[PDB]
């Protein structure tokens, strides 16, 4: 148990498969991550981390 509580969740800078939309997403989403343009699902909110479906570009703290 640390003195200070850090957040385990990260953020992900992600490039979409279809329309090549670049987005920032939460590592533990609660709803289905819909792209802005094509609207396809990107991350699936599961019990733990969301199941990313696009291609990660870079993690963010």
């Amino acid at each position: 148990k640390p003195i200070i509580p850090m957040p385990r969740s990260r953020f992900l800078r992600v490039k979409c498969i279809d329309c090549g939309n670049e987005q920032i997403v939460f590592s533990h989403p609660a709803t289905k991550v819909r792209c802005l343009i094509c609207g396809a699902t990107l991350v699936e909110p599961t019990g733990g981390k969301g199941i990313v479906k696009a291609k990660i570009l870079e993690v963010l703290e």
Binding site: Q23, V25, F26, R34
Partner: peptide, 8 residues
């Protein structure tokens, strides 16, 4: 939740 989820 939506802002943190999709807009990040």
């Amino acid at each position: 939740t939506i802002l943190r989820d999709q807009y990040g």
